[PDB]
Design a protein around this ligand. Structure first.
Ligand SMILES: *[C@H](CCNC(=O)CCNC(=O)[C@H](O)C(C)(C)COP(=O)(O)OP(=O)(O)OC[C@H]1O[C@@H](n2cnc3c(N)ncnc32)[C@H](O)[C@@H]1OP(=O)(O)O)CS(=O)(=O)c1ccccc1
Ligand SMILES: *[C@H](CCNC(=O)CCNC(=O)[C@H](O)C(C)(C)COP(=O)(O)OP(=O)(O)OC[C@H]1O[C@@H](n2cnc3c(N)ncnc32)[C@H](O)[C@@H]1OP(=O)(O)O)CS(=O)(=O)c1ccccc1
Ligand SMILES: Cc1cc2nc3c(=O)[nH]c(=O)nc-3n(C[C@H](O)[C@H](O)[C@H](O)COP(=O)(O)OP(=O)(O)OC[C@H]3O[C@@H](n4cnc5c(N)ncnc54)[C@H](O)[C@@H]3O)c2cc1C
Ligand SMILES: Cc1cc2nc3c(=O)[nH]c(=O)nc-3n(C[C@H](O)[C@H](O)[C@H](O)COP(=O)(O)OP(=O)(O)OC[C@H]3O[C@@H](n4cnc5c(N)ncnc54)[C@H](O)[C@@H]3O)c2cc1C
Ligand SMILES: [Cl-]
Ligand SMILES: [Cl-]
Ligand SMILES: [Cl-]
Ligand SMILES: [Cl-]
Ligand SMILES: [Cl-]
Ligand SMILES: [Cl-]
Ligand SMILES: [Cl-]
Ligand SMILES: [Mg+2]
Ligand SMILES: [Mg+2]
Ligand SMILES: [Mg+2]
Lengths: 437, 437
C-alpha cells in the first residue's frame, strides 16, 4: 500500500519505522509541519537544564538519514491542511514555498498530537515548550539576554520538569499556578513533597495566582503583586491538533480528539489515528480513556503496523494510564482511573507508608502507597505512590496486576524479591492486601 | 486453642503475632532454643559490616515486650527435644537448668528453620553466621584479635554479603568456593559481574578451591597453596533443624525437610510447619519447590494464622522463588524455576541488554534481562536480571506476571510508567515480548 503519515515524532515516525520492518516494498511518506522529525519530546526539559548537551540525544534522525536507513520519505515544513477522504488524498502546504498540493494514499495514519496552550499575552519574553524548535529558542533567549529570573506558569509534569531544570542550570525560577491543584494526575493530598522541595531550596511559588498584565519585563499579577522577570515559560495545558481534520468525514469528539477502535481505526476505512490525538478505553474498566503519553504512542504505532503489514489479529486491549514524574528528590506515580473518575464506582481506599527498604540499611525514605478498589468485585481501580525511593517499582507491579485483573486481596500473594536494600518480607504491596481484609 | 510454636523468629514469631491479631483469647507459647527472639536474620551481614550500628535494628523484640504488647509467652534458651504427637505434648529442655518438661498443645506450629553446616575442623578462628549470638561472637573476635585477613568460604548470597561487609569495614577478605557455581540462584553466565567487582577491588578469589587443613592460622588448600588468615567465616550451606522431629509421626523427606499441603499442614493432625523447614510446590508449574527465604516464612505465617483463627479457605498457591542480592554496585535477581530445573521443560530463551533508563539521562547503566518460556504454551518459566540499576523492578513485575501464568507474548502489553529517569516507552519487558516471535 501507499502509506501517508501525518506527524513525524512519537507515534508517526515510530509507526512508519515499524511498518518498514514488516513491509519493504510499500512507499511511505510522512508530512511534518515543523522543522524536526524524531525529536525526544521527553528529553526537552533536560536539554533546557543542560543535563542533555549532546544534540544526538535530542534528535534521533534527520529526514536525509531516515531515508538513507529506512527508505521512508519525510517532508518537514509540510503542513497537512485538509483530509480529502472521499478522494483518498490529503492536501498539503509546503511552508517553504507556500504552495499546496494533493498527496494520494492507500492507508493514512494520523499522529498529529497536541499543541501547547498559550495565555495569549503579547510578549517577547514568554515561551511554550513542545518541540525542539521551542527548546532552541528558549536556550537562545537565555543566553542572549543573560536570563536569571524566570517565571514558570502551570504545575503539571512539564512545568515541574522545566522548573527543576531551570534551577539546576543556575537560574532563579518562581512557580505560579491558577489554583492549588498541582500535578493533577496524582491524588491531590499526595503532592505536598512538591511544595516541600521548592521550600527546601528556597524556590518561591504562589498558588491561586495568575498573570494579570505584562509590560516588557514588568509582570503584574492577580494577587496585586508586581515583579520583574527576564523570561516566562507557560505550561498551561495542551489542545489537540485536529482543526485540519474537521472538514473531513472523520468523527471527532466534542473536545477535538479522534475515537478509535482496538485496531486504531477511525470511522473512515483505511484511516488510522494514534498517539495523543486518539481516544480509546481503559483495559480494566468499561470507561473511555485518553492517555496522551509515550507508551501509548509507541504501542499503538506497533499495533497499527501489524494491522497494515503484519498480523492483524493483534489488537489493543485498552489503557491503564500508568504515569510518572520526577521532581527533585521525589517520584510521583499513578496508574488506573483518574481521581475524578473514582466517583463512577462504589470504592474503598487502603494505604500504607513505609520505608522503601530496610530501615537499617542506609538511605531509607518513606514510601506512601495508596490503592483504590471496587467494592462490588474487589478489583483494583487506581494506585498511586510517592516517595524518594521505590515508587516506580510498586506502580509497575500494580500496573501488571491490573492487567491480569487482580483483586486487592490477591496482593497478599505477590511474591516480592526481598533483601534489605530492596523491600520487606511483607512488601508495601503485600500490606495493602492484608489491610484490605 | 492452646498454641505452641517452635522457633521464635521469621516464621514463628510472625505466626504467633498474626494469630494474636485474630484471636485475643487463646494462650500462645513460643519456645526458642537460643538467646534471642525476632532477630533480623537478614541484617546480620550488615551488622558485621558496621552499616548497622544500633542493635535495635538487629533485634525487634524481647520476650518481655512481646508479652506486654501481644500477651504471648516466649521462653528463650528452651529447646524442644521431642514431639509426643499422640498425646499432643512437646518435651522441652530448659537449657539453663538442664531440666526437661512437657508442654501441652491443641495446635503445634513448627518453624525451627535451618542451621549452618560446618566443615568440621577443630579451629578457634572459624565462624558460621545464622543468628545474633553468632554475629556478636564474630564482631567480638574481630576486635579482640585485630583481624585483617579473613577467609570467606562459600559463594552463596549470604556469604557474598558478608564479604562485601568485611571489605567495607576495612578488612581484607579472600573468597573461595568448592565449585564455580557462585550465587547459584542466578544464571551462571549472568554472575560474572560478581567476579568483575571483586577484580575491580583487588579482592582475591579462587573457585574450585577448598580447605585441606588448618594449623593455627596457617591454612592449607586443595590447590596446594598455604596462606595465613586471622579468621575464617564458613558459609557452606545449611541443614534443617529436624532431628528433634524424627521420633514423631511427622513425615520427613530424605533430606530432613517437612512436606506440607497448601494449608501448611503436616501429615499429623493439628501440627503445621512453615519457614525453611517446609517444602511445597511451585505456583506456575507442577514441580516441588523449596524456597528458604523470608517472604515465604512471612506468607506461611499469615496463612497458618488464618487456618487456625481466621478464614480457613485461605490457602497457599505455591512458590515462584523470587530472590535477589546486592553485591557492590550490582543487583542480581531471578524468579521462577531454578537453572537446573529448566531441563524438565521444552523451553526457549529471550534476552535484552539495554539502558535501565533513558540513554541521555545521567547515571545510566546496561541492564541485562533474560526470560525463559515453555514452548508448549508460551508461559514464562523463569526470569533473571542483572545490572547496577532497575533489575529489582523488572523481576518484581515478572513475578506478578507469572503469578498469573502470563505468556511471554503478552509482555508487549505491559504498560510501563515512563519518564526519562525510569525506563523507556518500550521497556525492556516489552522488548522481551516483541523479541519472542
Ligand atoms: C518522551 C516522549 C516520547 N517521544 C518519542 O518517542 C518521540 C521520538 N521517537 C521517535 O521518533 C521513534 O521512536 C524512533 C526514535 C524513530 C524509534 O523508532 P523504533 O521504535 O521503530 O526503533 P528503532 O527502529 O530505532 O529501532 C531500533 C531498535 O529497536 C528494536 N525494535 C524496534 N521494534 C522492534 C520490534 N517490533 N521487534 C523487535 N525489535 C524491535 C530494533 O531491533 C532495534 O535494535 P537494535 O537491536 O540494533 O538496537 C520520551 S523520548 O525521550 O522521546 C524516548 C524515545 C524513544 C526511546 C527513549 C526515549
Ligand atoms: C530477614 C529474614 C526474615 N526475618 C525476620 O522476619 C526476622 C524476625 N521477624 C519477626 O520476628 C516478625 O516478622 C516480627 C519482626 C516480630 C514482626 O511480626 P509481624 O509481621 O506480625 O508485624 P508487627 O506485629 O511487628 O506489625 C507491624 C506493622 O505491620 C502491620 N501489620 C502486620 N500484619 C498485618 C496484617 N496482617 N494486617 C494489617 N496490618 C498488619 C502492623 O499493624 C504494623 O503497623 P504500624 O503501627 O507500623 O502501622 C528479614 S529482616 O531483616 O529480619 C526483616 C524483618 C521484618 C521487616 C524487615 C526486615
Ligand atoms: C516537554 C514534554 C515532556 C514530556 N515528557 C513525557 C514523559 O516524561 N513521559 C511520557 O510518557 N510522555 C511525555 N511527554 C508526552 C509525549 O511526548 C507525547 O505523549 C508523545 O509525543 C505523543 O506522540 P504524538 O505522535 O501523538 O505527538 P508528537 O510526538 O507531539 O508528534 C506530533 C507531530 O505532528 C506534527 N503535526 C501536527 N499537525 C500536523 C499537520 N497538520 N501536518 C503535519 N504535521 C503535523 C507536529 O508538528 C508534531 O511534530 C512529554 C511531552 C512534552 C512536550
Ligand atoms: C545471614 C542471613 C541473611 C539472610 N538474608 C536473607 C535475605 O536477604 N532475603 C531473604 O529472603 N532471606 C534471607 N535470609 C533467610 C531468612 O532469614 C530465612 O528464610 C528465615 O529466617 C526463615 O525463617 P524460619 O522461621 O524458618 O527460620 P529462622 O528465622 O532461622 O528461625 C528458626 C528458629 O528456631 C529455633 N529453633 C530451631 N530448633 C528449635 C528447637 N528444637 N526448639 C526451640 N527453638 C528451635 C532456632 O534457634 C531459630 O531461632 C537470610 C538468612 C541469614 C541467616
Ligand atoms: Cl520556514
Ligand atoms: Cl509535489
Ligand atoms: Cl547550580
Ligand atoms: Cl483446637
Ligand atoms: Cl546456656
Ligand atoms: Cl515450667
Ligand atoms: Cl556501567
Ligand atoms: Mg547548550
Ligand atoms: Mg560496633
Ligand atoms: Mg514419642
Amino acid at each position: 500500500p501507499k502509506i501517508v503519515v501525518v506527524g513525524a515524532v512519537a507515534g508517526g515516525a515510530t509507526c512508519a519505522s515499524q511498518i518498514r520492518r514488516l513491509d519493504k516494498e510499500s512507499d511511505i511518506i510522512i508530512f511534518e509541519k515543523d522543522r524536526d522529525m524524531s525529536f525526544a519530546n521527553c528529553a526537552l526539559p533536560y536539554v533546557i537544564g543542560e543535563v542533555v548537551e549532546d544534540r544526538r540525544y535530542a534528535l534521533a534522525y534527520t529526514p536525509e538519514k531516515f531515508y538513507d536507513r529506512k527508505q521512508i520519505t519525510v517532508k518537514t515544513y509540510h503542513e497537512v491542511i485538509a483530509i480529502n477522504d472521499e478522494r483518498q488524498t490529503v492536501s498539503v502546504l509546503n511552508r517553504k514555498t507556500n504552495e499546496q498540493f494533493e498527496e494520494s494514499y492507500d492507508k493514512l495514519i494520523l499522529s498529529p498530537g497536541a499543541s501547547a496552550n498559550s495565555l495569549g499575552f503579547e510578549s517577547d519574553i514568554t515561551f511554550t515548550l513542545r518541540n525542539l524548535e521551542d527548546t532552541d529558542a528558549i536556550d537562545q533567549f537565555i543566553k542572549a539576554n543573560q536570563v536569571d529570573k524566570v517565571l514558570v506558569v502551570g504545575a503539571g509534569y512539564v512545568s515541574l520538569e522545566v522548573l527543576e531544570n531551570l534551577y539546576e542550570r543556575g537560574l532563579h525560577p518562581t512557580l505560579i499556578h491558577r489554583s492549588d491543584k498541582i500535578n493533577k494526575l496524582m491524588d491531590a493530598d499526595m503532592n505536598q513533597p512538591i511544595l516541600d522541595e521548592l521550600d527546601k531550596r528556597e524556590i518561591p511559588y504562589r498558588l491561586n495566582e495568575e498573570i494579570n498584565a505584562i509590560n516588557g519585563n514588568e509582570i503584574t499579577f492577580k494577587s496585586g503583586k508586581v515583579e520583574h522577570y527576564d523570561m516566562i515559560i507557560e505550561g498551561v495545558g495542551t489542545h489537540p491538533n485536529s482543526k485540519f481534520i474537521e472538514s473531513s468525514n472523520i468523527k471527532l469528539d466534542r473536545k477535538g480528539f479522534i475515537p478509535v477502535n482496538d485496531k486504531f481505526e477511525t470511522n473512515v476505512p483505511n484511516i488510522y489515528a494514534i498517539g495523543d490525538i486518539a481516544t480509546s478505553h481503559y483495559r480494566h474498566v468499561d470507561l473511555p480513556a485518553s492517555v496522551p503519553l509515550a507508551w501509548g504512542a509507541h504501542r499503538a504505532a506497533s499495533i497499527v503496523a501489524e494491522q497494515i503489514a503484519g498480523n492483524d489479529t493483534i489488537e489493543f486491549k485498552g489503557f491503564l494510564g500508568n504515569n510518572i514524574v520526577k521532581f527533585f528528590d521525589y517520584t510521583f506515580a499513578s496508574v488506573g482511573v483518574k481521581p475524578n473518575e473514582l466517583k463512577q464506582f462504589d470504592y474503598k481506599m487502603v494505604e500504607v507508608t513505609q520505608g522503601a527498604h530496610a530501615n537499617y540499611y542506609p538511605g531509607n525514605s518513606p514510601l506512601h502507597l495508596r490503592v483504590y478498589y471496587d467494592t462490588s468485585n474487589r478489583q483494583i481501580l487506581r494506585a498511586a505512590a510517592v516517595g524518594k525511593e521505590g515508587a516506580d517499582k510498586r506502580i509497575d507491579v500494580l500496573s501488571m496486576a491490573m492487567m491480569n485483573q487482580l483483586t486487592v486481596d490477591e496482593l497478599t500473594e505477590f511474591e516480592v524479591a526481598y533483601a534489605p536494600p530492596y523491600s520487606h518480607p511483607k512488601d508495601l504491596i503485600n500490606m495493602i492486601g492484608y489491610k484490605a481484609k
